[PDB]
Amino acid sequence: TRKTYTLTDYLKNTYRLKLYSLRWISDHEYLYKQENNILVFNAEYGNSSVFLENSTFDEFGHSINDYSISPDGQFILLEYNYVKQWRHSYTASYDIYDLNKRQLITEERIPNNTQWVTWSPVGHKLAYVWNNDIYVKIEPNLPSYRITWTGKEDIIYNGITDWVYEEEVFSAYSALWWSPNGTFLAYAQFNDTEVPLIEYSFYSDESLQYPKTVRVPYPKAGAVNPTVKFFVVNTDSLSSVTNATSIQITAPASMLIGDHYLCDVTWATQERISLQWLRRIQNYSVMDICDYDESSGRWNCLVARQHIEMSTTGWVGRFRPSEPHFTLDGNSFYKIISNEEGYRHICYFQIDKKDCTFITKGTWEVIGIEALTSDYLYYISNEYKGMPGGRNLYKIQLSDYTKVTCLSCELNPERCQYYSVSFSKEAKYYQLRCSGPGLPLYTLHSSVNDKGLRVLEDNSALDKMLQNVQMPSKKLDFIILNETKFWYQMILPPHFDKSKKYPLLLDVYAGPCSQKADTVFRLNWATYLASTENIIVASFDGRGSGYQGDKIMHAINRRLGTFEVEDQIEAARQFSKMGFVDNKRIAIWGWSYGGYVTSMVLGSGSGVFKCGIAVAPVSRWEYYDSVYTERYMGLPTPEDNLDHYRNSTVMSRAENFKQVEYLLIHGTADDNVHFQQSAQISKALVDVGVDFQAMWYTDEDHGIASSTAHQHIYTHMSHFIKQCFSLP
Amino acid sequence: TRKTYTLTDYLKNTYRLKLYSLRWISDHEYLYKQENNILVFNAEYGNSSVFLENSTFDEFGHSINDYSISPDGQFILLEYNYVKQWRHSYTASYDIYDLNKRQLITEERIPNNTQWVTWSPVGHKLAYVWNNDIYVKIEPNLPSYRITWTGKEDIIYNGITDWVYEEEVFSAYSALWWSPNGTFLAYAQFNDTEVPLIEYSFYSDESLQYPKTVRVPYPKAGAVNPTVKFFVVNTDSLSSVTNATSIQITAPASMLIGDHYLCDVTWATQERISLQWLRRIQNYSVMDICDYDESSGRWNCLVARQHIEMSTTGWVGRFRPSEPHFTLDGNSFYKIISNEEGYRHICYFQIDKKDCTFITKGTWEVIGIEALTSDYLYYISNEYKGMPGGRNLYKIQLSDYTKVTCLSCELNPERCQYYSVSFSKEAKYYQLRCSGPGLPLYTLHSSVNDKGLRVLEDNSALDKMLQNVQMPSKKLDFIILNETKFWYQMILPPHFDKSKKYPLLLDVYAGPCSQKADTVFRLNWATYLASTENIIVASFDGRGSGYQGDKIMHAINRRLGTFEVEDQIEAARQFSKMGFVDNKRIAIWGWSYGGYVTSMVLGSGSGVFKCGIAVAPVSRWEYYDSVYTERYMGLPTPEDNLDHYRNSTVMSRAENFKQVEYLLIHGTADDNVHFQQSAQISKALVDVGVDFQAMWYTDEDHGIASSTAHQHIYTHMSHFIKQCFSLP
């Protein structure tokens, strides 16, 4: 009898998924790390050479965390002393290595504790942020030119985002953008002077006698938000003037009338930049297209080139207005926007004309635009077989929109239905990355004739190992409710028998625009639960979920904690009505937004669930950040949506928890969903006399991802689920 | 056939013990509150009169927390708007009511948020502290005189103690001392300027959007301590035109050479005050006796009147040097000190003579001196039947120390073995309070011939109720370890059958000078565990425990976390050998110092215990406060005792928790044993991969005493223990 996929296998990663992470350095070459050596591959023929011997930095004296080669291939940036901060931010030390001279540069080194660094897109200029100010080095070994003098810890951020912009707007720490050929450096400046601070203790190593109080400018719903300004500086003038001028580009009048955000920055040409602004009430955004005026050294944004994007049913964009993809001459661009039917498709815009033309349409959506050439636009969508949880690469002829070719749909339909892509510099080649439903498969292709060049990694090694394991199977299907299809997936135990009644665990996230039902292959906790514990693990995408049109996504507008919660309960009812589920053993669990939904469900009094686990749950919307919360909930004031804010808390459902078994878990150093959120849930449960299980994780953040805490939490949850389901 | 004592009985106080709290107002009468009415009783005859109508304040508007009648009976201080701070501190509002004119005083009233207030010992002067400064009122309706002007929140404390002095030295918030007739007012001033602050979050009500950060000057072991100064002001010469002059009394030179503390202030006569000072290395103390000089208006403390108290085996006193009891003329005093055998007895001192004479002796100890007349000294001791856990009242003839008479031993030996007492103003009468082993008994006596006047409260009502309940019994006995006896007690289930095997729960505290084996009657969690769950609850007093001499108490000097932990394991090992104990079901639990011992025991690898519960445990001595910790551990420096500070942590024993079930509990707003202590334990366990159970209590402090949290924690621990013992 073959072994099963156990908890230890998951926690120790015995069955390793292989991937193929390459870095395009040109239009026909990429870098790949093999046996700690950096190799350079020729896409066309597959042959290669050693770009940088693994013994190059054996006496560097430091473990190198990452590297970055300059665009011209002349230097390599070495990152070490990596210190993580939030989801994307971190600080580190950097050294620059001269490839040609094969020497490390020791003069005018990048400062320690540097917050962000980036090469110019062409050549080898560098821009970095240190102590919240921007610096530019024209040459690696020469002195830096300071660009800003206003930087101030926790107050003024130049070229880097503050906490909320990093997490909710840019999903990046950097807030600087080099123009295409490197002449200009654009950047944002955030001012958090009046933004309130979240404070929590950090205990650190046992040797620290007094706990440290961490303080972070973080605007909770309805609080004072950071303000923002945008500037552009000409780096080519740096060595000619003592102090180069940063030219400010002001937001439009329609934005200046109230609170607003800078939400996108995209260069069009060497002398034209586009910026998108979003009002604090996130259903109105404006894009300005600004040109450099060589006679005045200023940037002007013609109103005739301004584009408005608004929404009558919800917020704008999936999580923010989408980015534009400009044609080479910068006179037109393509952008994903929702059409009249509520589905996101690609629209073609002339920069000085307000009405655009949709080039794709249908009851499916475009996920992203991947590359644009003079003759073709490449994009990823879920059109294939009408499966919203699938992803394929398509090519559309710019001179004839009726000519659309799916480049990945039929490569291996049974094994591959979820693709992402990586194009070379001028799109001459592309790497396809299949991530499911079968084992991930990485392949290389030539754009000139769309022919497959070779398989890069097929995971045959893993497939061989899994042959001797009783793996679970995955079912992806839908149920019809109110004439609408809603998709779900089920991880089913080996030798599934529909004549038996299996316990069921509902794995939930369900946040706005989320998707938990897809064709991706995963080896995770659910794999062990189904394989070893014979538990069915299901997920359902109901109202509020994404990639299926606005009608579904905007159903929860201004009403978080309602339909998305109700639909998970209904999904459980539908699953029990399938005949192979033990109604007496239905559990539910979720992390983050999933923890909020899990808690709301356990406190609904539905009687459908026996037990549930919430990890780092949101508990009341006024405790979460402004940008994310307000996008879906508006403002917490009597004149706007305060009543629903107060009506959608977990605490108000405390009494109903007497009907279930609950495990509440939270990391004490969670900078995202503050420990405070679970602290209030527990106090409300204690106040009504409800017993429950709890676990805090000292110094862990929203990811509870340290190696030991990760193993500890899944082990703890495994015992809780096995006990609730009466499993040996 | 009858009911047992249930968890609900304990949590809802179904069976209440009646008390008889009286307040002596002279040598012949006392005040007693009955039906909200304050009555005055004549001690000789037992007749009473109404002193103050319960309705007198029907329209007061505020809920009165407590009351305090001036010594001359002319006024009554009304306390309301009570707001608790630490163990003893709190702030409140006050109003003074004139009893003669039956009117509430409205002129010059005591401010709101007053930190401390007290009537002078004679008459009706008042002294109060507000905003950290001292004020004095000669008449209730007249304006107050500002005595100090340096008061500053969290920095300068005049007349009130800072956190550490409140908890560890004076066991009180008050740092004011009126002279016998009220002429002088002595006070201490604490300076916490350089004391580090402990910081932690307070979540408050759900409505608070951002958690609050509490900051408290708290010196952990080895950190900078507050400094202290002492002053005396003459309240009979106060002027409303000039600021009051406070005369400072400086500490002796042997104290000023290094860090030190003020540990006792006791007035001897109208013009003589004694003060005891203690070195930061708590084995050297000095008492100064100071006399007022009418000519200079200064206070002089003659070196010839200095008395040194030191210890070569440990620290000085049980928790601090004991208080002196001066004779009427103030020329001599009686004080409890450790004799040459290491047993605490009463020594008689001449104020200007170095050698004192012990007036009691034996292998037992005097607990406290209770009253002194020219012919007799009254004291409580555990001499009777050689039981260190028993307490009786004795009197010794000052003219012949061989004449010692026990006054409570034979009153009712079967019901009463643990007494405390309350003497009238001139020791003419005394109230005896028996607290066990039977139900509490309160009686009144006359000193002239020790007549038993009457029974004040015999709890016959409770006795009648308990007759219908299957109550547990208590066994007090000893085991011998190395020729030394150590006492233990066992709460035994109803109908205890020595032929059956019972699970056993070891209830531990075990801090230095602690005593957990005694003759006190208690209705608590253990009562329920024994009565309803048939669990034997045991407690043992090992090395380090009190009231049995320094040989036992000082055994753990400079060595916390060693002998006291080992002795609990040895006791359990012995109890497990007994025929009526199921060695497969032995558990252990403790709170505070008891949580530390429980944790050190569970991490010892002894294999004796199946499970255990630690509530608000200390985990590393460097995290606890200086005054208490250093008293037993010295300083955490390599030159002193750092190695043992580092070897006595719970964290270092994490690996050994793999074979036990552990439940760790802690209140997040614990200002005494910071949450930090449990946060480091959990992280250590996560780091070695040990699973355990946890529960935090939002906003609860060291007492986890709020009504809902109290019920919740005992409910949670009860489930944990029953589950560990496989009990229905």
Ligand SMILES: *[C@@H]1O[C@H](CO)[C@@H](O[C@@H]2O[C@H](CO)[C@@H](O)[C@H](O)[C@H]2NC(C)=O)[C@H](O)[C@H]1NC(C)=O
């Ligand atoms: C891959 O193999 C090709 C063919 O051998 C290499 O082609 C070289 O191309 C350069 C142009 O830059 C010509 O001057 C040479 O004739 C070719 N090399 C030699 C040694 O003759 C190519 O360099 C190889 N690429 C890698 C990364 O190894």
Ligand SMILES: *[C@@H]1O[C@H](CO)[C@@H](O[C@@H]2O[C@H](CO)[C@@H](O)[C@H](O)[C@H]2NC(C)=O)[C@H](O)[C@H]1NC(C)=O
């Ligand atoms: C960041 O924003 C703050 C306001 O929140 C600005 O501070 C004000 O600056 C003006 C101009 O000197 C002063 O008169 C005010 O007293 C300041 N107000 C506050 C609340 O500090 C600040 O100038 C901005 N900083 C930058 C670099 O833009």
Ligand SMILES: *[C@@H]1O[C@H](CO)[C@@H](O[C@@H]2O[C@H](CO)[C@@H](O)[C@H](O)[C@H]2NC(C)=O)[C@H](O)[C@H]1NC(C)=O
């Ligand atoms: C470079 O130019 C900037 C912009 O003029 C200077 O920044 C100003 O500095 C003055 C005085 O130090 C302040 O009053 C202004 O508020 C600053 N403006 C900004 C936008 O920061 C900067 O000091 C100059 N650096 C040097 C070396 O001259």
Ligand SMILES: *[C@@H]1O[C@H](CO)[C@@H](O[C@@H]2O[C@H](CO)[C@@H](O)[C@H](O)[C@H]2NC(C)=O)[C@H](O)[C@H]1NC(C)=O
């Ligand atoms: C990058 O683009 C910039 C902007 O077009 C170029 O700078 C201009 O160069 C022209 C010469 O062709 C000059 O007449 C202008 O004065 C320059 N404008 C500015 C703002 O500098 C720049 O030459 C390009 N860089 C490279 C390497 O091609």
Ligand SMILES: *[C@@H]1O[C@H](CO)[C@@H](O[C@@H]2O[C@H](CO)[C@@H](O)[C@H](O)[C@H]2NC(C)=O)[C@H](O)[C@H]1NC(C)=O
């Ligand atoms: C309380 O005791 C003080 C000190 O002995 C008394 O004050 C003294 O009173 C006499 C009058 O007989 C004066 O000669 C002294 O100068 C006073 N000394 C001081 C320091 O004031 C006071 O009278 C006593 N109070 C009561 C009510 O007996």
Ligand SMILES: *[C@@H]1O[C@H](CO)[C@@H](O[C@@H]2O[C@H](CO)[C@@H](O)[C@H](O)[C@H]2NC(C)=O)[C@H](O)[C@H]1NC(C)=O
């Ligand atoms: C009070 O206790 C301290 C510490 O135990 C004693 O001081 C010295 O402590 C060090 C270790 O920290 C020893 O090496 C010394 O032998 C101790 N004695 C001296 C004089 O340094 C101190 O002796 C104790 N005081 C009394 C009166 O016993």
Ligand SMILES: *[C@@H]1O[C@H](CO)[C@@H](O[C@H]2O[C@H](CO)[C@@H](O)[C@H](O)[C@H]2NC(C)=O)[C@H](O)[C@H]1NC(C)=O
């Ligand atoms: C208790 O009883 C005595 C009587 O024995 C009361 O009487 C004493 O005090 C009265 C005023 O308080 C006087 O009117 C009596 O003359 C006096 N008698 C004696 C013998 O002392 C006494 O007041 C009563 N005390 C209380 C508190 O009610």
Ligand SMILES: *[C@@H]1O[C@H](CO)[C@@H](O[C@H]2O[C@H](CO)[C@@H](O)[C@H](O)[C@H]2NC(C)=O)[C@H](O)[C@H]1NC(C)=O
């Ligand atoms: C309380 O203690 C502080 C610190 O010991 C006293 O201030 C002293 O220390 C300062 C630095 O912290 C020095 O700059 C000063 O010279 C010294 N004195 C003063 C007045 O600052 C402080 O005075 C003390 N306060 C009181 C009322 O005693």
Ligand SMILES: *[C@H]1O[C@H](CO)[C@@H](O[C@@H]2O[C@H](CO)[C@@H](O)[C@H](O)[C@H]2NC(C)=O)[C@H](O)[C@H]1NC(C)=O
């Ligand atoms: C302390 O607070 C109390 C209650 O607020 C004060 O009492 C009065 O409160 C009323 C409202 O209830 C106010 O309008 C008055 O101003 C307060 N004072 C008086 C005299 O009525 C009280 O005054 C405060 N303590 C002090 C010393 O002012």
Ligand SMILES: NC(=O)c1cccc(-c2ccc([C@H](N)Cc3cc(F)ccc3F)cc2)c1
């Ligand atoms: N920047 C983008 O365009 C973009 C593109 C894809 C996804 C996202 C994205 C989506 C969700 C977030 C939320 N902070 C996730 C989240 C939700 C919550 F309730 C509690 C905690 C939490 F962490 C943050 C960023 C952003």
Ligand SMILES: NC(=O)c1cccc(-c2ccc([C@H](N)Cc3cc(F)ccc3F)cc2)c1
């Ligand atoms: N002031 C006195 O003379 C006196 C008399 C009797 C008892 C005490 C006394 C005894 C112990 C304390 C300790 N802070 C108790 C304690 C110990 C610990 F590890 C963790 C927390 C904690 F809370 C505080 C005061 C003091």
Ligand SMILES: *[C@@H]1O[C@H](CO)[C@@H](O)[C@H](O)[C@H]1NC(C)=O
């Ligand atoms: C490069 O370094 C690695 C260390 O991880 C070593 O194992 C490998 O053999 C080296 N490369 C070659 C070609 O030997």
Ligand SMILES: *[C@@H]1O[C@H](CO)[C@@H](O)[C@H](O)[C@H]1NC(C)=O
């Ligand atoms: C970075 O800091 C380290 C540690 O102090 C120091 O040794 C090194 O010289 C610094 N490097 C630079 C470039 O400043």
Ligand SMILES: *[C@@H]1O[C@H](CO)[C@@H](O)[C@H](O)[C@H]1NC(C)=O
């Ligand atoms: C944007 O949202 C606000 C709040 O619901 C609403 O009042 C306003 O009309 C909306 N604007 C549009 C164009 O829908």
Ligand SMILES: *[C@@H]1O[C@H](CO)[C@@H](O)[C@H](O)[C@H]1NC(C)=O
């Ligand atoms: C005073 O009020 C209490 C209310 O708790 C009442 O029981 C008592 O009878 C009242 N006093 C008198 C003398 O009636």
Ligand SMILES: *[C@@H]1O[C@H](CO)[C@@H](O)[C@H](O)[C@H]1NC(C)=O
């Ligand atoms: C009393 O002392 C304080 C503080 O030094 C001062 O402000 C006040 O004016 C003084 N009052 C008199 C009457 O001297």
